[PDB]
Amino acid sequence: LGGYMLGSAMSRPIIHFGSDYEDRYYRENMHRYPNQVYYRPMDEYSNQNNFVHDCVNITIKQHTVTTTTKGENFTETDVKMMERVVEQMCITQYERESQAYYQR
């Protein structure tokens, strides 16, 4: 996992899991969860959600791998929480640079 750059940061979004505890558990700890995503400048092929799929996957996985070796045992919930958040971040990132392709 090289040959990629990291965009600006965006405000760690509070996707609701349907239970205030999951919301707050994340929230107080939201400093731990990622606030940026791996992307490219406009890429070469642009997509609604398939971009998000891989943009998320790589960013999610880059937590999941490292965290294991930084002595932080992350379970399905420490990933699935993050997943919704990284999905947002990749949506936001796509929409944030692709918007300005129509303003050049």
Curated annotation (Swiss-Prot):
Annotated consequence of substituting T64K: In early-onset dementia and dementia due to prion diseases
Post-translational note: The glycosylation pattern (the amount of mono-, di- and non-glycosylated forms or glycoforms) seems to differ in normal and CJD prion.
Glycosylation sites: N57, N73
Impact upon substituting D54N: In FFI and CJD
Keywords (A to Z) from UniProt: Amyloid, Amyloidosis, Cell cycle, Cell membrane, Copper, Disease variant, Disulfide bond, Glycoprotein, Golgi apparatus, GPI-anchor, Growth arrest, Lipoprotein, Membrane, Metal-binding, Prion, Repeat, Signal, Zinc
GO molecular function: amyloid-beta binding; aspartic-type endopeptidase inhibitor activity; ATP-dependent protein binding; copper ion binding; cupric ion binding; cuprous ion binding; glycosaminoglycan binding; identical protein binding
Domain of life: Eukaryota
GO terms (BP aspect): cellular response to amyloid-beta; cellular response to copper ion; cellular response to xenobiotic stimulus; dendritic spine maintenance; intracellular copper ion homeostasis; intracellular signal transduction; learning or memory; long-term memory
Cysteines paired by S-S bonds: C55-C90
UniProt subcellular location: Cell membrane; Golgi apparatus
GO CC terms of this entry: cell surface; cytoplasm; cytosol; dendrite; endoplasmic reticulum; external side of plasma membrane; extracellular exosome; extrinsic component of membrane
Effect of E95K: Confers relative protection against sporadic Creutzfeldt-Jakob disease (CJD) in the heterozygous state
Effect caused by changing V79I: In CJD; uncertain significance
Involvement in disorder: PrP is found in high quantity in the brain of humans and animals infected with neurodegenerative diseases known as transmissible spongiform encephalopathies or prion diseases, like: Creutzfeldt-Jakob disease (CJD), fatal familial insomnia (FFI), Gerstmann-Straussler disease (GSD), Huntington disease-like type 1 (HDL1) and kuru in humans; scrapie in sheep and goat; bovine spongiform encephalopathy (BSE) in cattle; transmissible mink encephalopathy (TME); chronic wasting disease (CWD) of mule deer and elk; feline spongiform encephalopathy (FSE) in cats and exotic ungulate encephalopathy (EUE) in nyala and greater kudu. Creutzfeldt-Jakob disease: Occurs primarily as a sporadic disorder (1 per million), while 10-15% are familial. Accidental transmission of CJD to humans appears to be iatrogenic (contaminated human growth hormone (HGH), corneal transplantation, electroencephalographic electrode implantation, etc.). Epidemiologic studies have failed to implicate the ingestion of infected animal meat in the pathogenesis of CJD in human.
Description of its domains: The normal, monomeric form, PRPN(C), has a mainly alpha-helical structure. Misfolding of this form produces a disease-associated, protease-resistant form, PRPN (Sc), accompanied by a large increase of the beta-sheet content and formation of amyloid fibrils. These fibrils consist of a cross-beta spine, formed by a steric zipper of superposed beta-strands. Disease mutations may favor intermolecular contacts via short beta strands, and may thereby trigger oligomerization.
Family: Belongs to the prion family.
Assembly mode: Monomer and homodimer. Has a tendency to aggregate into amyloid fibrils containing a cross-beta spine, formed by a steric zipper of superposed beta-strands. Soluble oligomers may represent an intermediate stage on the path to fibril formation. Copper binding may promote oligomerization. Interacts with GRB2, APP, ERI3/PRNPIP and SYN1. Mislocalized cytosolically exposed PrP interacts with MGRN1; this interaction alters MGRN1 subcellular location and causes lysosomal enlargement. Interacts with KIAA1191. Interacts with ADGRG6.
Function summary: Its primary physiological function is unclear. May play a role in neuronal development and synaptic plasticity. May be required for neuronal myelin sheath maintenance. May promote myelin homeostasis through acting as an agonist for ADGRG6 receptor. May play a role in iron uptake and iron homeostasis. Soluble oligomers are toxic to cultured neuroblastoma cells and induce apoptosis (in vitro). Association with GPC1 (via its heparan sulfate chains) targets PRNP to lipid rafts. Also provides Cu(2+) or Zn(2+) for the ascorbate-mediated GPC1 deaminase degradation of its heparan sulfate side chains.
Note: This protein is produced by a bicistronic gene which also produces the alternative prion protein/AltPrP (AC F7VJQ1) from an overlapping reading frame. The alternative prion protein/AltPrP (AC F7VJQ1) and PRNP have no apparent direct functional relation since a mutation that removes the start codon of the AltPrP has no apparent effect on the biology of PRNP. In mouse and hamster, the alternative initiation AUG codon is absent and is replaced by a GUG codon.
Protein name according to UniProt: Major prion protein
Organism: Homo sapiens (Human)
Higher taxonomy: Eukaryota, Metazoa, Chordata, Craniata, Vertebrata
Residue range from the parent sequence: 125 to 228 of 253
